[PDB]
Amino acid sequence: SGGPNVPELILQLLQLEPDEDQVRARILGSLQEPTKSRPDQPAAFGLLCRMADQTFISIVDWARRCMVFKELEVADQMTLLQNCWSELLVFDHIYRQVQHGKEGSILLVTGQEVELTTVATQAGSLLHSLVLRAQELVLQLLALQLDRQEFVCLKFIILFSLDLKFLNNHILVKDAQEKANAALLDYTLCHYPHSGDKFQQLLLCLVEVRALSMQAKEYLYHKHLGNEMPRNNLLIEMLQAKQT
């Protein structure tokens, strides 16, 4: 629901969440910049790549001003991001469909709608599958009645969903994971008016988000091998980072 008693971590995360209007304008403005369009590709492909890059830019900004994360060193900060970047982008996309959702189309961060019929006839089987799978998560999260409080908590959980051995500051990150889960559990137990373990049901979704994110990287990798990606693409840099 709303919350007379909302976990402090969640309340703070709500205030750290960027404004969708200014994010949209900033990205729209970024896409307006003139570019060297290659003649062997639809111009839309390059723009969509840049759009996703700028989306990740805004996501990195969000992480930077997060509690605990801001108290970390650049070494650990990069490690966390290099591990959860695709997951955060996918989850961003998914929640966008939850907020503003017609079942016949998907909404992009720029504000433009693409009907599923377009994707079915214009996209390859891989991307088509990714979009359809993502919509299944959206449908499930709507059924579970995902709200803003849970979304920001889930994002935070995603950010720190890593094995402690790959980081330098164990205690600080370990504490964050425990607090994040506790917050999610506390909120769901206090707010879910239905039956079913919402805390566990949401964590199951994260498992699917992560698997969905894996396939997205495979899509990016395929385009990368075919020299289809624009040079100095941020996502490809993230994809080419050493895996932890």
């Binding site: 990195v60 650049v74 990069m78 991001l81 290099q82 100095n232 840099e237 993230m238």
Partner: peptide, 12 residues
Amino acid sequence: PSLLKKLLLAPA
């Protein structure tokens, strides 16, 4: 060296 590092080291 990397865009990600230059992004985290940004002043704003």
